């Protein structure tokens, strides 16, 4: 059931912003590793004396990488005279974030009809304000509320190219990389206590629980058309193998964003391209499931995927799970930086055609059991 | 003249350590951009709860990338019980360094006969101590003194593979990249006042002035065999075009390391390989000199380089200068990170055969005049 109870009009995921120590090096690594193009910049060469911000795009996916300059460059500025292109930015908040959590997501940004009203309504409904609505060049409005930990939910609305004050990047520095990634499917938070986190976020958004069907409990919040998907996890304590949610909270110094799931229009090509680059500057992937997992795929999805397509999943280490509505292919990277905290998921969904409805196939929860049974069977051989 | 006045026995440049916010992303970017292999690590997977350190190598060149974990992981430790593989490391010093300077070089490390005696003698001769000698696993001794700004000169000595506590990296994560870079030729500091910087460093090392022959004055300190080369620059103020040394000091918040010159055994291949990767995660280069600069090369070095070799320099944007002893080919990257501070030089030297003596060809100082005259001539066409 979908009660469609959004308290404001929400469109789609707009962008994800990483707070970094050096935005240049993170952005160049991610660009090569994920096949994203340099699309826009706001830095010293555009008159920004406050922060360096570089935007990568692939299809509709937008990754923003921001780091602070020396405060000395902007010491004479005040907020009314700021050269920052993102007015919510603050040197002290950014350094403290990165000092505390390491490299990670500061902002999950969604495009809304009216960022000011979304902010007003959210705060009227319990959201903790982080940055009030600010209108950029009479053209774009941006506002922020606390989501969990030090992550903000950022609202953006356009009267009618990323943000005012950003410049298009020179063609020569913009190499048209593309490994098939097209959009953000969902963004996942880790918290110590799922209940209060859910109540808070669903409280101020009107997002509803999205129906599902070790080491965690989780629930997914969704917008009216279920294209904005915000799962949240808590750990399950005192188990056998220590909870990876608990490991996250320890190394991250508390709650924060756990993984970003990026939809590919051709997950075979995406993973071929990402895996060729894993050891030359790109991203590493979790160890592949054993061959027993792929033998078991015939009985589970043999009607969806041919044997050759299954052998292709085996080559690339792809996981497969299935709903009552659709089928999903997925794989997880190793952590994106030094700490065992944030990682990336690549996802492609089969089914639920009407366009494709969101969450088609679910989120792969059945793969914990399947991989475990596969592990037992592989030891048996 | 070389008075050979080293106060302790110095061998060669050993490694350069970058202090980072996330060592993983900087190291992966540099590896792809410069063609350096992942050689060793010290991190959570090796039992280091304090810092993440990753070593890249190409030939004899060693780049170390280090970042701090959350202090909470090592809160129960004391220095006698530390899990840090580099005992001079300190969370607060590293965060403060990076907060203040951004991404840059913390340590210029030279291999000496006896790091304890080198430290003792240096401090007896005016060096400011930074970290005292510590013997690692009865095998390697490391000590540090202040060089300029927040950069240290690190002494390392071996009784008889990088440092104890580091592990060799798994073959699969170690892709054998190689674009021809072989060793560190020299490492250059920027300071507000050259005189006191020179007197201090030459004071405690015994390094002598290495004979030479806009915006800067400079001088080069050298070890006995002139294989360790430490140039230092100060700005020249009130000019026409603002001094790039002054621009460095402003954006770096004071003195620090300006550039690293990396010797290539085949600068044509190095630059071909680096330029292919500039816009896909690698490094950018300074804008090429105009064709007039390359026409003028025939009269300057036509006896050293064939016309085809000169046309190859033109293709790759390589600069050429010449001594009374030898010829050097050089090129400069754009800044390595967000700030207009540290950059890299690629260098190859022709001549001074006996092995090749250090500094053969000088450091390219004649290229300021040559490029300026070349600019005037190119506008004329
Ligand atoms: C990264 C290192 O972990 C590898 C272990 N692992 C395994 C494995 F391989 F063990 F089966 N299966 C998974 C299946 C789904 C999801 C996931 O995306 C999800 C979940 C669950 N709920 N919601 C709302 C989601 O979006 C995730 C993270 C995993 C996962 O992490
Ligand atoms: C990076 C942006 O600057 C580009 C402008 N530029 C030019 C240009 F192109 F203008 F001619 N020529 C140079 C020649 C030599 C050196 C250099 O390595 C050196 C110097 C001088 N003294 N010592 C001890 C050295 O090692 C350097 C930096 C440059 C340089 O920076
Ligand atoms: Co997921
Ligand atoms: Co140089």
DSSP code for B361: T
Q: Which residues from chain A sit within 8 angstroms of residue B73, using beta carbons?
A: 250-251
Residue that the structure tokens 């390359």 belong to: B294
Domain of residue A293, residue span: 181-379
Asked if residue A310 and residue A343 are part of one domain, the reply reads yes
A280 and B32 within 8 Å at the Cβ level: the answer is yes
For B255-291, b/e burial (b = at least 16 CB within 10 A) is: bbbbbbbbbbeebbebbebbbebbbbbbbbbeebbbe
Whichever domain contains B37, its CATH number is 3.10.180.10
Pocket of ligand 1 contains residue A371 by CB under 6 Å: yes
Domain boundary among A173, A201, A233: A173
Q: What residue's CA is closest to ligand 1, atom 17?
A: A363
Same domain, B161 and B185: no
Measured between CB atoms, which of A22, A102, A338 is closest to B338? Answer: A22
> How close is the Cα of A365 to the center of ligand 1, in Å?
7
Task: Name B217's bridge partners.
Answer: B234
Phi, psi of A330 (to 5 degrees): -150, 155
CB contact under 8 A, A280 and B177: yes
Q: Does A114 share its domain with A211?
A: no
Q: Which residues of B touch A102 (CB under 8 A)?
A: 21-22, 67, 69-70
- Nearest Cα of chain B lies from the Cα of A281 at a distance, in angstroms, of 4
- Helix, strand, coil percentages in chain A from 3-state DSSP, rounded to 5: 30, 35, 35
Q: In this structure, which residues have their CB less than 5 angstroms from ion ligand 3? A: A 261, 345, 363
Atom of ligand 1 nearest to the CA of A188: 26
Same domain membership, residue B117 and residue B16: yes
Does the residue B107 lie in any domain? Answer: yes
Q: What is the whole-number distance in angstroms between the Cα of residue A259 and the centre of ligand 3?
A: 7
In total, how many domains does chain A have? 2
Backbone angles phi, psi at A137, to 5 degrees: 55, 40
Which atom of ligand 2 has the smallest separation from the CA of B368?
11
- Whether residues A351 and A297 share a domain: the answer is yes
Last residue of a domain, one of B125, B155, B173: B173
- Nearest by Cα to A325 from A351, A297, A303: A351
Q: At what angle do helices A23-34 and B23-34 cross, to 10 degrees?
A: 70
Q: Would residue A2 count as lying in a domain?
A: no
User: Which CA distances in Å does B124 have to B112, B128, B153, B154?
Assistant: 17, 10, 15, 16
CA distances from B364 to A45, B205, B211, B371 (A): 28, 25, 13, 11
CB contact under 8 A, B43 and A338: yes
Same domain, B268 and B324: yes
Whether B5 is covered by a domain: the verdict is: no
Q: Is B323 helix (H, G, I), strand (E, B) or coil?
A: coil
As given in the structure block, the two tokens for residue A380 are 């048996």
Task: Confirm or reject: Cβ of A286 under 6 Å from ligand 1.
Answer: yes
Query: 3-state DSSP call for residue A262?
Result: strand
- Angle, vertex CA A311, rays to CA A305 and CA A314, nearest 5: 110
Q: Note whether A162 and A265 are same-domain residues.
A: no
**H-only helix segments in chain B:** 23-34, 91-101, 115-124, 194-205, 244-252, 267-276, 291-295, 297-301, 307-316, 367-380
d(CA A113, CA B44): 45
Distance B334 CA to ligand 2 centre (A): 12
Task: Tell which residue, A267, A255, A245, A273, has the closest CA to residue A361.
Answer: A267
**Measured between beta carbons, which residues in chain A are less than 8 angstroms from residue B338?**
22-24, 43, 52, 67, 69
Measured in whole angstroms, the distance separating CA A46 from the mean position of its chain's CA atoms is: 27
Q: Which helix (H) or strand (E) holds B343?
A: strand B343-351
Cβ(A364) – ligand 1 distance below 6 Å: yes
**Secondary structure E strands in A287-332:** 319-322, 326-332
CA dihedral A190, A192, A194, A200 (to 10 degrees): -90
Residue to substitute from A20, A250, A338, A344, interface B, most B β-carbons within 10 A: A338
The distance of Cα B298 from the centroid of its chain, to the nearest Å, equals 31
Residue B1 lies in a domain: no
Which residues share a beta bridge with B144? B131, B154
Residue B2 placed within a domain: no
Q: Do B183 and B196 touch, CB atoms closer than 8 A?
A: no
Chain A nearest CA to B255, separation (Å) = 14
Q: For residues B115 and B234, state if they share a domain.
A: no
Which one of A125, A152, A173 terminates a domain?
A173
Q: What is the gyration radius of the CA atoms in chain A, in angstroms?
A: 21
Three-state DSSP string of B160-204: CCCCCCCEECCHHHCCCCCCCEEEEEEEEEECCCHHHHHHHHHHH
Q: Are residue B152 and residue B185 in the same domain, yes or no?
A: no
CB pairs under 8 A between A and B: 124
Which chain B residues are within 8 Å of A28, Cβ to Cβ? 29, 33, 281-282
Confirm or reject: Cβ of A123 under 6 Å from ligand 1: no
Question: A22 to chain B, minimum CA–CA distance in Å?
Answer: 6
Give domain status of residue A4, yes or no: no
For ligand 4, the distance from its centroid to the CA atom of residue A364, given in whole angstroms, is 54
Backbone angles phi, psi at A246, to 5 degrees: -65, -45
Determine, for residues B280 and A103 on separate chains, whether the beta-carbon distance falls below 8 Å.
no
Q: Judge if B252 and B368 occupy the same domain.
A: yes
In-domain check, residue A1: no
The β-bridge partners of B216 are: B235
3-state secondary structure of B222: strand
Ligand 1 lined by A333 (C-beta under 6 Å) = no
């Amino acid at each position: 059931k979908n009660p469609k109870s959004d308290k404001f009009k929400v469109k789609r995921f707009h962008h994800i912003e990483f707070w970094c120590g050096d935005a240049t090096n993170v952005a160049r690594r991610f660009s090569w590793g994920l096949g994203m193009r340099f699309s826009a910049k706001s830095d010293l060469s555009t008159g920004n004396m406050v922060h360096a911000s570089y935007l990568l795009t692939s299809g509709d996916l937008r990754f923003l990488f921001t780091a602070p300059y020396s405060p000395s460059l902007s010491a004479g500025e005040i907020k009314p005279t700021t050269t920052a292109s993102i007015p919510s930015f603050d040197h002290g908040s950014c350094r403290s974030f990165f000092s505390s959590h390491g490299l990670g997501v500061r902002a999950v940004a969604i495009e809304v009809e009216d960022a000011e009203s979304a902010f007003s309504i959210s705060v009227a409904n319990g959201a903790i304000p982080s940055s009030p609505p600010i209108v950029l060049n009479e053209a774009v409005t941006i506002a922020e509320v606390k989501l969990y930990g030090d992550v903000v939910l950022r609202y953006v609305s356009y009267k009618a190219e990323f943000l005012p004050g950003f410049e298009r990047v020179e063609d020569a520095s913009s190499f048209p990389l593309d490994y098939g990634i097209r959009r953000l499917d969902h963004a996942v938070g880790n918290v110590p206590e799922l209940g209060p986190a859910l109540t808070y976020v669903a409280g101020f958004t009107g997002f509803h629980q999205f129906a599902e069907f070790s080491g965690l409990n989780s629930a997914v919040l969704a917008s009216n058309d279920e294209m904005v998907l915000l799962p949240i996890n808590e750990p399950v304590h005192g188990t056998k193998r220590k909870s990876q949610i608990q490991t996250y909270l320890e190394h991250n110094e508390g709650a924060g964003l756990q993984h970003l799931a990026l939809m590919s229009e051709d997950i075979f090509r995406t993973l071929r391209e990402m895996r060729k680059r894993s050891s030359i500057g790109g991203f590493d992937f979790m160890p592949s499931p054993p061959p027993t997992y792929y033998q078991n795929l015939k009985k589970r999805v043999g009607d969806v995927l041919s044997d050759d397509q299954i052998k292709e999943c085996e080559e690339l280490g792809i996981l497969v799970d299935r709903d009552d509505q659709g089928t999903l292919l997925q794989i997880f990277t190793k952590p994106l930086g030094d700490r065992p905290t944030i990682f990336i998921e690549i996802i492609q969904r089969v089914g639920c055609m009407m366009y494709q409805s969101g969450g088609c196939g679910g989120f792969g929860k059945g793969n914990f059991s399947e991989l475990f049974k596969s592990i037992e069977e592989y030891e048996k051989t």
